[PDB]
């Protein structure tokens, strides 16, 4: 029953805490927590490849893609491993994150421990935007806050 946690920080006011739980090996992962300081609405939410914070969130590299697929939404088969879709901030700017995903893992080749969770400035178009960038990042915009994913239990 592996457990992980991530403290999202950035230059601006967006900040949060996101926990992860995987009861069985290679089974679904629960992702739950809270982000704040966001504009109301949808915000891209991804696991990026590197747990490098030397030059801010930019050092995290691209979306975690150990299978070298194209960007999509979490429900699509063609997707990055770290494509977690969008989180929703209310009028107050608080996104209550509740997600269940079977592509990310806390072990094996799809392990995200030691990589970087990142919340984005705008919505992820899930790869349906009809342009090249949509097949890469989903046009979610700049990185508002991020953090290395660490072992919790």
């Amino acid at each position, epitope marked *: 029953a592996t457990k992980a946690v991530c403290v999202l920080k950035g230059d601006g006011p967006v900040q949060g805490i996101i926990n992860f739980e995987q009861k069985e090996s290679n089974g679904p992962v629960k992702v739950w927590g809270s982000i704040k300081g966001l*504009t*109301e609405g*949808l915000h891209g939410f991804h696991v990026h490849e590197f747990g490098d914070n030397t030059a801010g969130c930019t050092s995290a590299g691209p979306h975690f893609n150990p299978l070298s697929r194209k960007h999509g939404g979490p429900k699509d088969e063609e997707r990055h491993v770290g494509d977690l879709g969008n989180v929703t901030a209310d009028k107050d700017g608080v996104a209550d994150v509740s997600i269940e995903d079977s592509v990310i893992s806390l072990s094996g080749d799809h392990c995200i421990i030691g990589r970087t969770l990142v919340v984005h400035e705008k*919505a992820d*178009d*899930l790869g349906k935007g009809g342009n090249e960038e949509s097949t890469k990042t989903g046009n979610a915009g700049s990185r508002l806050a991020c953090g290395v994913i660490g072992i919790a239990q």
Partner: nanobody
Amino acid sequence: QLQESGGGLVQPGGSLRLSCRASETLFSLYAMGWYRQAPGKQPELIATISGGGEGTGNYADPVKGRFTISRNNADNMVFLQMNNLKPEDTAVYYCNVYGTNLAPWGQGTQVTVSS
């Protein structure tokens, strides 16, 4: 829930401004797109607007540089300004959310380009 208007017949090179009134619950996700749909085909996403403030727009390749998407937060409305229209643009246009579960489609508005 979603109500589009502003379409019609326009000669090649002309222009149009589609409008859509969306419910406040759908608008408040601040991820709105215009899709175009040809007969028998699936609706493709054509323009997106998301983020705070006045919003930020992104465009699919066949319309980039000719179409602009915008929104009015107070009126909960979305707009597609289409310029330099071509026959390939002929389609029924719909406005919906994106980046999440699609809401029930509206009636859309037909756009025909021909001289």
